[PDB]
């Protein structure tokens, strides 16, 4: 649960998020070091690492996966589960039979700030944890379409690489597509009030439309 190069520092927190102990040190001492020791300090105890050792940002613990990922698009044990966008600005695992579309106006004269203004690239203090920043500002904008599921009854578990299956049209001849997978915190978090309703992005990325068919030939 670290930011870039976060492994070589402290891993207890990232932005407003809080994790279980120094996750960075944890790895350095329990996995990194012993692993290196095996091959570098002859006579050392050998380690048997799995495919992936990943921290769970939901369960708040380390997950040891013998074979990861277990689900994916091609060749994995299982397949990905499509979370469909639906009318009413919602999300459902049940493919909406009816056709539909929601629109927004992307005005380049007023581009969406990736993080609250004002930001200068020199502000490392702001650049480092920008990926866990609250996505509520964007939501309040008319140039950002947003969809959400109903307050979860039972937890939904995810592990692997999410894929954006997006069917979008632009009135222009080019366009960038930013997709953000977000975990909205509970409406109210009495133990830590500031987190109440916090729109925390677990995964997001941008895609330049001009490379839709060939990254090599725009």
Residues that bind a second copy (CB under 8 A): 10, 12, 18-22, 60, 105-107, 109-113, 116-118, 134, 136-137, 139-144, 187-191, 193-198
Q: How far is the CB of 56 from a second copy (least distance, A)?
A: 13
Q: How far is the CB of 125 from a second copy (least distance, A)?
A: 12
Of 217, 141, 208, the closest CA to residue 179 belongs to 208
Other beta carbons within 10 angstroms of residue 14's beta carbon come to 19
Residue 92 has which token pair? 């459902």
Kindly compute the dihedral angle of the four CA atoms of residues 196, 199, 202, 204, in this order, to the nearest 10 degrees: -170
Backbone phi and psi for residue 208, each to the nearest 5 degrees, phi listed first: -75, 115
From the CA atom positions of the chain, what is the Rg in Å?
A: 21
CB closer to a second copy, 38 vs 106: 106
CB closer to a second copy, 20 vs 37: 20
CB closer to a second copy, 159 vs 185: 185
Backbone phi and psi for residue 203, each to the nearest 5 degrees, phi listed first: -160, 135
CB closer to a second copy, 107 vs 174: 107
Q: How far is the CB of 158 from a second copy (least distance, A)?
A: 22
Strand partners, 14: 17
Strand partners, 180: 204
CB closer to a second copy, 43 vs 190: 190
CB closer to a second copy, 66 vs 194: 194
Q: How far is the CB of 64 from a second copy (least distance, A)?
A: 18
Of 44, 24, 23, 22, the closest CA to residue 35 belongs to 44
Q: How far is the CB of 27 from a second copy (least distance, A)?
A: 13
- In sequence order, the 6+-apart residues with CB closer than 8 A to the CB of 9 are 24
Q: How far is the CB of 1 from a second copy (least distance, A)?
A: 12
């Amino acid at each position: 649960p670290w930011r870039h190069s976060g492994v070589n520092y402290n891993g207890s927190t990232l932005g407003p998020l809080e994790f279980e102990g120094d996750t960075a040190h944890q790895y350095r001492r329990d996995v990194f070091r012993p692993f290196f020791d095996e091959y570098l300090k002859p006579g050392s105890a050998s380690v048997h690492l799995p495919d992936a050792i990943i921290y769970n940002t939901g369960d708040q613990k380390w997950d040891y996966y013998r074979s990861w990922p277990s689900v994916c698009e091609s060749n994995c044990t299982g397949g990905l589960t499509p979370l469909y966008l639906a009318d009413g600005h919602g999300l459902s695992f049940t493919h909406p039979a009816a056709d539909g579309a929601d629109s927004y106006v992307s005005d380049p004269a007023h581009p969406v700030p990736f993080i609250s203004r004002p930001f200068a690239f020199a502000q490392s203090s702001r650049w480092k944890p920008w990926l866990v920043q609250d996505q509520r500002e964007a939501e309040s904008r008319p140039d950002v379409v947003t969809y959400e599921t109903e307050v979860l009854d039972e937890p939904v578990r995810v592990s692997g690489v999410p894929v954006a299956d997006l069917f979008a049209a632009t009135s222009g001849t080019d366009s960038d597509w930013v997709v953000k997978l977000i975990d909205v915190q509970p409406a109210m978090t009495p133990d830590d009030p500031k987190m109440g309703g916090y729109e925390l992005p677990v995964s997001m990325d941008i895609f330049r439309g001009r490379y839709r068919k060939d990254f090599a030939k725009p």
